Amino acid sequence: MNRTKKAIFEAAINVFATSGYNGSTVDEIASKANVAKGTLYYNFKSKEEIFNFVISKGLEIWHEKLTDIENLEDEPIEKLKKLFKMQFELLYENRAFFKMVMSQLWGKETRQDELRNKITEYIEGIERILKEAISKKQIRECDISLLAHSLFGSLISTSLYELSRDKEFNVNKVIDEITINILDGIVIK
Amino acid sequence: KAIFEAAINVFATSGYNGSTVDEIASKANVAKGTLYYNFKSKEEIFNFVISKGLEIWHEKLTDIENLEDEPIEKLKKLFKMQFELLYENRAFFKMVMSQLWGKETRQDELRNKITEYIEGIERILKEAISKKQIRECDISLLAHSLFGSLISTSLYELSRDKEFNVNKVIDEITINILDGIVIK
């Protein structure tokens, strides 16, 4: 990304995360990016084009880091432990971006169908690790797609927990707790 | 009442930003003057919609809290109750999700309302921990994860364009949460 696209990218994340999609404007993104509006429009025709570019660029590191985990020779159960650590670290390093995503996952605009298709592509990588884990009898036989969405969904509920105003968020403690909760369950054993 | 059902659809479809009082009155088939005898602003309508819609969640959660059941059995009934209510209130749930993440003051207040519900889950988990029926753990983090089971399922249904059988979901999620997924 050159300076113009990087500046728009970083500013757009914060505008979208602060105001939501409908409340964000090209006008505000140009101002926050310190990019002349004519140069912005030379690169992006509309707010929707900026949004989709940000989603596509921002999810690149998610696919990259998940693909790296998939490529390891580690046992699948060890890949799942590394998945939880990777996702929460990535979430913590990119909180504005993830809120932007979360704010747009629930409606019926074509933009949001497309966003969900991009998230589904990511979740399919989780499904692939689970399938291998089940075949190696390291994870219980279960509805894989349902489980994979639950593993992604841990990011969503934790993002809400991170917004708590009465405590301070500790990413390493959350990784450790969620890993045990997911793998071992909560029942006394 | 007409405003409540219409405003869910409007806030879901047109957003909070992007919707108007007039559009809500129209979708409700409510004369604008009659709207203003009930509500002063679009903000008042939103705050009313959230509070009203969450009442049934609080009522059913309180019912479970009031049971004589062991807390671990309360938790099983909580999962069942939550997925049932999710199924009956699908539009409302997704509308809430769409509004939960921004920095406007109505959204601070929305999150406070959700947090209050999640605090009710924390009370059941606290009883389960005292009775040594579940592990000692970060109770607030776990309670958010238990609410998160609905978030994940709702996203799953949207992403696959499905309305999954509620009993099969309850059965799978309950085992996943209580017993975990690892075989070791």
**How many residues in total does chain B contain?**
184
Phi, psi of B134 (to 5 degrees): -130, 165
Residues B92 and B35 in one domain: no
Tell me the β-bridge partners of A187: B134
Residues B37 and B127 in one domain: no
What does the block give as tokens for A30? 């140009």
Residues B79 and B105 in one domain: yes
Distance CA B100, CA B114 (A): 9
Chain B residues closer than 8 Å to A100 by CB? 101
Residue B36 DSSP code: H
Q: Is B182 helix (H, G, I), strand (E, B) or coil?
A: strand
What does the block give as tokens for B105? 């003051």
Q: Beta-carbon neighbour count of residue B31 at 10 Å?
A: 11
Whether B138 contacts chain A with CB within 8 A: yes
What does the block give as tokens for B52? 């009203």
Domain count, chain A: 2
Reported resolution in A? Answer: 1.8
Distance CA B49, CA B6 (A): 10
Distance CA B86, CA B163 (A): 11
Q: Compute the 3-state secondary structure of chain A and give helix, strand, coil in percent, each to the nearest 5.
A: 80, 0, 20
Residues B34 and B53 in one domain: no
**What was the experiment behind these coordinates?**
X-ray
Q: How far is B2 from chain A (nearest CA, A)?
A: 22
- Find the domain containing A86 and state its range: 52-189
Integer Rg of chain B from CA: 18
Residues A125 and A32 in one domain: no
* Of residues A150, A13, A159, the one with CA closest to residue B114: A159
Instruction: Note whether B39 and B45 are within 8 A (CB).
Output: yes
Distance CA A31, CA A7 (A): 10
Residue B17 DSSP code: B
What does the block give as tokens for A13? 């994340």
Residues B106 and B168 in one domain: yes
Instruction: Note whether B177 and B149 are within 8 A (CB).
Output: yes
Residues A72 and A140 in one domain: yes
Distance CA B57, CA B85 (A): 7
Residues A43 and A116 in one domain: no
Q: How far is A41 from chain B (nearest CA, A)?
A: 23
Taking only residues 144 to 183 of chain B, the set having a beta carbon closer than 8 angstroms to any beta carbon of chain A reads: 144-145, 147-149, 151-156, 158-160, 164, 168-169, 172-173, 175-183
Residue A143 DSSP code: -
Chain A residues closer than 8 Å to B158 by CB? 105-106, 116
State the CATH number of the domain containing residue B31. Answer: 1.10.10.60
Residues B61 and B39 in one domain: no
